[PDB]
Amino acid sequence: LKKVLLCVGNELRGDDGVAIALGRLVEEQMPEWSVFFGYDTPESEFGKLRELAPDVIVVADAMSGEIEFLDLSDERTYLYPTPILISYLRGICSKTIFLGISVLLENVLHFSEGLSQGASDSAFVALGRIKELDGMLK
């Protein structure tokens, strides 16, 4: 069963690379998952995506202002950060799942490389949920 994790974010903007961090974790712990780093140009990954025809796409991102985890295959759910991205993915794949990792806005406003303890913890918590989703998929 083909499972993709598309990681979005900018590693030069602090905690805005949290989803890049998560990507590296899945890459290590979860070989059955193929991880695509889109960084800040996720669209650069559509080619590979069409070509691989995944069964499941999880798209992960920092969201500034906890973890949002939703199946955008559900229409009601779709209806109510990456809008044009997300609707493209739903077109490649029915099981498009969004995973939002909330970050502090003060932590994404600077040129800064690396995560805050909080965002770091958040990425491990997010790994947790990918693992939970993985189990459900069996």
User: What angle do the packed helices 117-136 and 18-29 form, to 10 degrees?
Assistant: 50
Contact 122/19 with Cβ under 8 angstroms? no
Contact 82/62 with Cβ under 8 angstroms? no
Q: Other C-beta atoms within 10 Å of 115: how many?
A: 21
* Residue-range domains of the chain with CATH: 1-138 (3.40.50.1450)
Residue type, 50: R
N-to-C CA span, the chain: 9
d(CA 103, CA 83) in angstroms, rounded, equals: 19
Where helices occur in 56-116 by DSSP H, the ranges are: 75-79, 83-92
Strand 95-103: give its sheet, edge to edge. Answer: 33-39, 3-8, 56-64, 95-103, 67-71
Method: X-ray
DSSP state for residue 42 in the 8-state scheme: G
d(CA 114, CA 24) in angstroms, rounded, equals: 13
Contact 105/7 with Cβ under 8 angstroms? no
d(CA 61, CA 117) in angstroms, rounded, equals: 17
What are the structure tokens assigned to 35, written together?
């991880």
Strands of the chain, DSSP E: 3-8, 33-39, 56-64, 67-71, 95-103
